[PDB]
Enzyme design. Structure first.
Site, PDB file in Angstrom:
ATOM      1  N   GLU A 196      -5.102  -3.365  -7.263  1.00 35.12           N
ATOM      2  CA  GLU A 196      -5.474  -4.031  -6.024  1.00 35.12           C
ATOM      3  C   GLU A 196      -6.435  -5.180  -6.324  1.00 35.12           C
ATOM      4  OE1 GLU A 196      -4.094  -3.459  -3.269  1.00 35.12           O
ATOM      5  OE2 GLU A 196      -3.317  -1.408  -3.321  1.00 35.12           O
TER       6      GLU A 196
ATOM      7  N   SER B 101       0.799  -1.225   0.000  1.00 31.98           N
ATOM      8  CA  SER B 101       0.000   0.000   0.000  1.00 31.98           C
ATOM      9  C   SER B 101       0.834   1.277   0.000  1.00 31.98           C
ATOM     10  CB  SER B 101      -0.950   0.019   1.201  1.00 31.98           C
ATOM     11  OG  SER B 101      -2.082  -0.796   0.968  1.00 31.98           O
TER      12      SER B 101
ATOM     13  N   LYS C 221       0.396   3.733  -2.956  1.00 32.51           N
ATOM     14  CA  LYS C 221      -0.749   4.626  -3.085  1.00 32.51           C
ATOM     15  C   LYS C 221      -0.349   6.094  -3.042  1.00 32.51           C
ATOM     16  CE  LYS C 221      -3.789   1.159  -1.062  1.00 32.51           C
ATOM     17  NZ  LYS C 221      -4.450   0.674   0.178  1.00 32.51           N
TER      18      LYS C 221
ATOM     19  N   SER D  59       1.190  -3.357   3.870  1.00 31.36           N
ATOM     20  CA  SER D  59       1.312  -4.739   4.302  1.00 31.36           C
ATOM     21  C   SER D  59       0.912  -5.658   3.157  1.00 31.36           C
ATOM     22  CB  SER D  59       0.456  -5.025   5.541  1.00 31.36           C
ATOM     23  OG  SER D  59      -0.919  -4.925   5.230  1.00 31.36           O
TER      24      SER D  59
ATOM     25  N   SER E 106      -6.046   3.630   3.693  1.00 33.94           N
ATOM     26  CA  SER E 106      -5.505   2.545   2.876  1.00 33.94           C
ATOM     27  C   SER E 106      -6.617   1.780   2.164  1.00 33.94           C
ATOM     28  CB  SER E 106      -4.643   1.602   3.717  1.00 33.94           C
ATOM     29  OG  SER E 106      -3.675   0.946   2.919  1.00 33.94           O
TER      30      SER E 106
HETATM   31  C1  LIG Z   1      -3.751 -13.500  -4.149  1.00 36.72           C
HETATM   32  C2  LIG Z   1      -4.443 -12.141  -3.981  1.00 36.72           C
HETATM   33  N1  LIG Z   1      -4.081 -11.533  -2.661  1.00 36.72           N
HETATM   34  C3  LIG Z   1      -2.792 -11.868  -1.997  1.00 36.72           C
HETATM   35  C4  LIG Z   1      -2.180 -10.598  -1.209  1.00 36.72           C
HETATM   36  N2  LIG Z   1      -3.231  -9.824  -0.450  1.00 36.72           N
HETATM   37  C5  LIG Z   1      -2.810  -8.804   0.575  1.00 36.72           C
HETATM   38  O1  LIG Z   1      -1.666  -8.630   0.786  1.00 36.72           O
HETATM   39  N3  LIG Z   1      -3.824  -8.018   1.334  1.00 36.72           N
HETATM   40  C6  LIG Z   1      -3.377  -7.032   2.325  1.00 36.72           C
HETATM   41  C7  LIG Z   1      -4.174  -5.719   2.130  1.00 36.72           C
HETATM   42  O2  LIG Z   1      -5.130  -5.711   1.443  1.00 36.72           O
HETATM   43  N4  LIG Z   1      -3.735  -4.456   2.807  1.00 36.72           N
HETATM   44  C8  LIG Z   1      -4.504  -3.225   2.603  1.00 36.72           C
HETATM   45  C9  LIG Z   1      -3.988  -2.499   1.390  1.00 36.72           C
HETATM   46  O3  LIG Z   1      -3.524  -3.145   0.419  1.00 36.72           O
HETATM   47  O4  LIG Z   1      -4.019  -1.228   1.350  1.00 36.72           O
HETATM   48  C10 LIG Z   1      -4.421  -2.293   3.861  1.00 36.72           C
HETATM   49  N5  LIG Z   1      -3.056  -1.709   3.962  1.00 36.72           N
HETATM   50  C11 LIG Z   1      -2.432  -2.070   5.284  1.00 36.72           C
HETATM   51  C12 LIG Z   1      -1.661  -0.913   5.796  1.00 36.72           C
HETATM   52  O5  LIG Z   1      -1.833   0.231   5.298  1.00 36.72           O
HETATM   53  O6  LIG Z   1      -0.823  -1.075   6.732  1.00 36.72           O
HETATM   54  C13 LIG Z   1      -3.545  -2.487   6.302  1.00 36.72           C
HETATM   55  C14 LIG Z   1      -3.011  -3.513   7.297  1.00 36.72           C
HETATM   56  C15 LIG Z   1      -4.127  -1.238   7.050  1.00 36.72           C
HETATM   57  S1  LIG Z   1      -4.772  -3.206   5.292  1.00 36.72           S
HETATM   58  C16 LIG Z   1      -3.587  -7.558   3.726  1.00 36.72           C
HETATM   59  C17 LIG Z   1      -2.498  -7.665   4.596  1.00 36.72           C
HETATM   60  C18 LIG Z   1      -2.685  -8.149   5.893  1.00 36.72           C
HETATM   61  C19 LIG Z   1      -3.968  -8.528   6.321  1.00 36.72           C
HETATM   62  C20 LIG Z   1      -5.057  -8.421   5.451  1.00 36.72           C
HETATM   63  C21 LIG Z   1      -4.870  -7.937   4.155  1.00 36.72           C
HETATM   64  C22 LIG Z   1      -4.609 -10.042  -0.720  1.00 36.72           C
HETATM   65  O7  LIG Z   1      -5.438  -9.758   0.084  1.00 36.72           O
HETATM   66  C23 LIG Z   1      -4.987 -10.634  -2.023  1.00 36.72           C
HETATM   67  O8  LIG Z   1      -6.020 -10.356  -2.535  1.00 36.72           O
END
Ligand SMILES: CCN1CCN(C(=O)N[C@@H](C(=O)N[C@H](C(=O)O)[C@@H]2N[C@@H](C(=O)O)C(C)(C)S2)c2ccccc2)C(=O)C1=O
Length: 260
Positions: free
Chosen positions: A139, A43, A46, A210, A103
């Site tokens: 995303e 993220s 962004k 993350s 995020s």
């Molecule tokens: C194979 C597809 N695939 C694999 C990879 N992936 C992710 O890495 N999702 C991540 C996600 O969508 N993270 C969100 C994001 O991409 O801003 C938010 N950014 C983090 C931040 O700014 O610190 C958050 C912890 C506030 S959530 C995720 C990480 C940890 C726990 C839940 C979600 C997925 O969810 C996904 O769809």
């Protein structure tokens, strides 16, 4: 140096791969640890998408007020703000604020669509002199963080230099730069990362990130009390795909840096 030995020890105790880039604007001195290695941005990318839309607003004076429709098909895995406006509209300003301060992944995908795809976000990086940043996916697949995969990655050195130009430099107009700084300061997701390792009197604007493989990222511009501001990037990833987030590593890295 002394700080590089401490960062090296912090990396060894965590079992992962740590990348740090510090830029002290007092004398343009830099502290780097794995500063030229590529890390999954997650993220943290962004900020580039929001800054690119801000650059478009220097010509299109009313672009930030343009309504954007939020349909149920647009929602992905994490959309805390976009879900409050389904079957309604959000302005590009409200979408940029949701992507940065909460995020929101749906807001990120809307910004990417405004720029004409991931290639349009990468284009803005090249336009301001970032030859390392690359955005390849939308995303939420851009967070796969697969080891060795160059897709959706940058280096600590490059992100710290680019973040300095966007917030402290003049890569953007005056009005757009102040809007970006205001958005970063109002971030809601970074209390346990870089902010946790710095004195409470320091004003911090940051963007966390993350993903898979325990990827835990945070990029920040730091305003110490009565001192020239700092820019600090902290990237961290792990070998196990299902590894837990390690925001304490970013806080400890920021504490090690702040000791100097
Ligand atoms: C194979 C597809 N695939 C694999 C990879 N992936 C992710 O890495 N999702 C991540 C996600 O969508 N993270 C969100 C994001 O991409 O801003 C938010 N950014 C983090 C931040 O700014 O610190 C958050 C912890 C506030 S959530 C995720 C990480 C940890 C726990 C839940 C979600 C997925 O969810 C996904 O769809």
């Amino acid at each position: 140096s002394a700080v590089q030995q401490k960062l090296a020890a912090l990396e060894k105790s965590s079992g992962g791969r740590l990348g740090v880039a510090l830029i002290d604007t007092a004398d343009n001195t830099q502290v780097l640890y794995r500063g030229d290695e590529r890390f999954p941005m997650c993220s943290t990318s962004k900020v580039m998408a929001a800054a690119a839309v801000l650059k478009q607003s220097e010509t299109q004076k009313q672009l930030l007020n343009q309504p954007v429709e939020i349909k149920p098909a647009d929602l992905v895995n994490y959309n805390p703000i976009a879900e409050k406006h389904v079957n309604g509209t959000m302005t590009l300003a409200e979408l940029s604020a949701a992507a940065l301060q909460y995020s929101d992944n749906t807001a990120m995908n809307k910004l990417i669509a405004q720029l004409g795809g991931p290639g349009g976000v990468t284009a803005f990086a090249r336009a301001i002199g970032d030859e390392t940043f690359r955005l390849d996916r939308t995303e939420p697949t851009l967070n796969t963080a697969i080891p060795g995969d160059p897709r959706d990655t940058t280096t600590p050195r490059a992100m710290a230099q680019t973040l300095r130009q966007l917030t402290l430099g003049h890569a953007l107009g005056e009005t757009q730069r102040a809007q970006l700084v205001t958005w970063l300061k109002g971030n809601t997701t970074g209390a346990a990362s870089i902010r946790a390792g710095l004195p409470t009197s320091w004003t911090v604007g940051d963007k966390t990130g993350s993903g898979d493989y325990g990827t835990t990222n945070d990029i920040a511009v730091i305003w110490p009390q009565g001192r020239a501001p700092l820019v600090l990037v902290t990237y961290f990833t792990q070998p196990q795909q299902n590894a837990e987030s390690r925001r304490d590593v970013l806080a400890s890295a920021a504490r090690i840096i702040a000791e100097g």
